[PDB]
Amino acid sequence: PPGGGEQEPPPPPAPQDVEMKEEAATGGGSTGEADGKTAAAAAEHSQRELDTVTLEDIKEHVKQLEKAVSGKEPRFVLRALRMLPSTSRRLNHYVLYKAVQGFFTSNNATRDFLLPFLEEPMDTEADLQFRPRTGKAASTPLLPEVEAYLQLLVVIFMMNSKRYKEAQKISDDLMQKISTQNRRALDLVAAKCYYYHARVYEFLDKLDVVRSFLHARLRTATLRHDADGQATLLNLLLRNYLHYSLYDQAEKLVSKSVFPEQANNNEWARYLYYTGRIKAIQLEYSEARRTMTNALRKAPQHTAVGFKQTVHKLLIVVELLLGEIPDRLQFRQPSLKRSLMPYFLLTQAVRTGNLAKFNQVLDQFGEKFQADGTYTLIIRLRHNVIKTGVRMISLSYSRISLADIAQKLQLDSPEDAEFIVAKAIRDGVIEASINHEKGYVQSKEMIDIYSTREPQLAFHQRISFCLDIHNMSVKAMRFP
Amino acid sequence: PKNPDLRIAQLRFLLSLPEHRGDAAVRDELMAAVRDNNMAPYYEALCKSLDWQIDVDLLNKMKKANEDELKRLDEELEDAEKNLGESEIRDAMMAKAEYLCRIGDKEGALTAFRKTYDKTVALGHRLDIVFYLLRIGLFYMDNDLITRNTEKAKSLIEEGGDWDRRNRLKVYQGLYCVAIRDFKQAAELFLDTVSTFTSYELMDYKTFVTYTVYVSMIALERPDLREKVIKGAEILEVLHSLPAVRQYLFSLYECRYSVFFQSLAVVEQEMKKDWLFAPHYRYYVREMRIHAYSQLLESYRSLTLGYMAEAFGVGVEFIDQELSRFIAAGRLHCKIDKVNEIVETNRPDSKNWQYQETIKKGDLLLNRVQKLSRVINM
Amino acid sequence: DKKFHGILDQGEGVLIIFDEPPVDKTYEAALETIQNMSKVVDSLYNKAKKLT
């Protein structure tokens, strides 16, 4: 009590100052760019929307007793905002309830009272047109509650707050939809909740109610408005078609909605990764591993974010399904040092000819392998054990006999040699041909890449790419 | 004093890690343990090294009387302040911090060297201090903190050449600049060999040359490395002295490919009884095999390995499994043949190689301007 | 030692002489400008990072 008593006054005013003003500037500035800025398809509060991705995950989690954040919600939900005299009353209330936090006690709404606090956005001539403002004020019941990671009995009130927010889809689709493009703000709000409502439906059973909801929520795209709303829901559509283990995947291929042309270099990066696992399970590898490689290098710009741990894991799995041999820890992380150690042993036994050592490690570390979601390697890895050897020889020898490639592979005999030399050409391993006069396997060399029109085929896309950047630059320049 | 102190840390680097090789090691560790007033690093070997001798009482009195020889004057100074100068005098900590590094440990060195750092602001005082932090950086081999003050002396203390701190810019190409980045920091930075003499602190020259000839033939294959190693004259005198250096040089340039396994094993036999015993040929042998092969596979585009059975060495099957290691993992650009018994080579063209190179850099810069297009503009 | 523009064959006992192309100069100077263009985007990369 003398030790913990004096440590009480400094913790409240740091959220009471800067966590007070940030959405106070955001809720003012986006409103002035909802009223003004008719071309508010890309607000500068879309980067603040990207800030609110990062802000409330680290700024505040609980409502900060000793009365710091507990008074924000009864302030910011008490918004009627009638006109300039009766909004300047509320502009005084941004200042007046600060004395209620500091001098007085705040209004403690422990996980329940925010749902009856959604009547103050109806009380005394409130505003329904500001569905960005009330849409952010429909995110704010979640923002201390969900982001505290309770997942405990207020999940149903997580749900009921989202049903009020799904009723804000209804207010977008039925109540005065006049050219404001607020869905492209609401879809990112429909993302944020349905990252955790995804997690909520991982704490419970299947989502066929939301499947009927998500198809209808996807349905209103491509006709009304289409930017990043179609995209983010499509990963939410894909991830649990993938998480459930049914056929599920040719439906994804015929789902011809792949192309909203951009997703701000974040959603489109993982979008290639979710469909990269899809194309890998139907045995296509070289087309799979090139968008596996594309997804790893598109948005890795953090430190061990968690799905970067997964795309780096799955990438050389399918490259150990062709049989080229890259291994793993050339970009190692502290969250990767533990998660490399079974995957450590997995790729060394590919190059060596010992398989009981490989069957030792699979029996040793199968529980980690089964935790990763890579059950079906062993039904097709013993395939590539002898395919890695035969490609290494065919890359080494230019004109190999059948009668010699066996005895090096501890394969005993010149028939067990070309028991690996009739599908590898059909699988696209080696160019080489076989004559039944000598039984020798000889390949040739490629020379005509510069002698014939290979380069100007590749250049025409890259000429067309560089002129697009010049076109994106000049069109987005003279805003002053 | 501290200039023959190079030997003690190097012999301590030698002893324990070869477990079988410990007979002559302890026969001169006793010279390094109880003599020269060496105090710390063997008491920390109390569960590392052998059983022990009674090294306790004979030397704890010798650390005590020699500390009592020093610890009285260093902490007090007050002596020439009787005639009131700056209320101090400069004879105390600049003269006895060197014992605090030689026999005193790094803890007595770190608190003394920073104490005499702010005492005098000259580069010539910051000359010898930073070089003592770097000499002790080899002694207790804490080889990460002393990577800092090199660059901190590269920034401020290094203002040029023009014989200077070049005395220990012999602390800028064999303690810190070329270690495990070594492909070209031995190449670009070993261009000067320009002196000979062994002064009272140049205790290692002739065996030091055996380093810089074993790392010489690495930088450039034949765009005239041969002048700086064979037409050079100061290198000519020591190969006139040392046949193991001379024959190993004159095997490679004069293209005696058969005597390489002889001349490599003599280098290998020299690498059997050397102190360097933790991480080894981070260049050498089967790159020197591919260095032997890159000049051998050059000038012959249709070669047979029956000719390899005597021109380079024996073991027809041994060469065959050797080239299978080298071709198949991205080195030694050729294509070996079976029962025709041919070693055929293929090369990129003058444009196929560059089209392969411009397609790599073009993808990196395109991926770069992908990202910066969308960081700005939403 | 580049005294001569030739090549030998062990399986033929045959010396073969070819000429020298002076061509490889445009592609050589091409990729070095890409090395300079790598740094000017890096110079713009922290410029946007320091201030939006």
Partner: peptide
């Protein structure tokens, strides 16, 4: 292909130089 690769980077300088001058003249005006 070389000439396009620089012309795009040149036009990208004019973005950041305008976007710095846009909002920083705005945020000091307000």
């Amino acid at each position: 292909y070389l000439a396009s690769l620089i012309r795009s980077v040149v036009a990208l300088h004019n973005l950041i130089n305008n976007k710095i001058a846009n909002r920083d003249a705005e945020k000091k005006e307000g």
